[PDB]
Design a binder for this molecule. Sequence first.
Ligand code: QE2
Length: 89
Amino acid sequence: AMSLNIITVTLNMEKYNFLGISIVGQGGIYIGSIMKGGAVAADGRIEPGDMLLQVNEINFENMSNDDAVRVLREIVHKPGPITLTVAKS
Ligand SMILES: O=C(O)c1cc(F)ccc1NS(=O)(=O)c1ccc2c(c1)CCCC2
């Protein structure tokens, strides 16, 4: 049928320090902006306005903005791949 517009992206973080995103919201958490030099810009698929559902083992639905920033820092700080599931609608 018609797409649910849910995409899962796995980023190899071997060549990047950062995702290079800013997040907005807490009716969820959204990509506010994408920064040049990060893994997300290089991959090209995640856009501003995409809604974050899950990153690695953590669900981002009805999360506080503060909690989202803090747990993304720890997910990025830890070497290894990062899997993001986003809603594009
Ligand atoms: O790696 C990220 O882009 C990132 C994004 C967030 F929303 C939260 C944490 C992240 N990881 S991080 O190393 O702490 C960090 C904090 C701030 C910023 C970045 C990374 C990269 C873009 C400029 C602002």
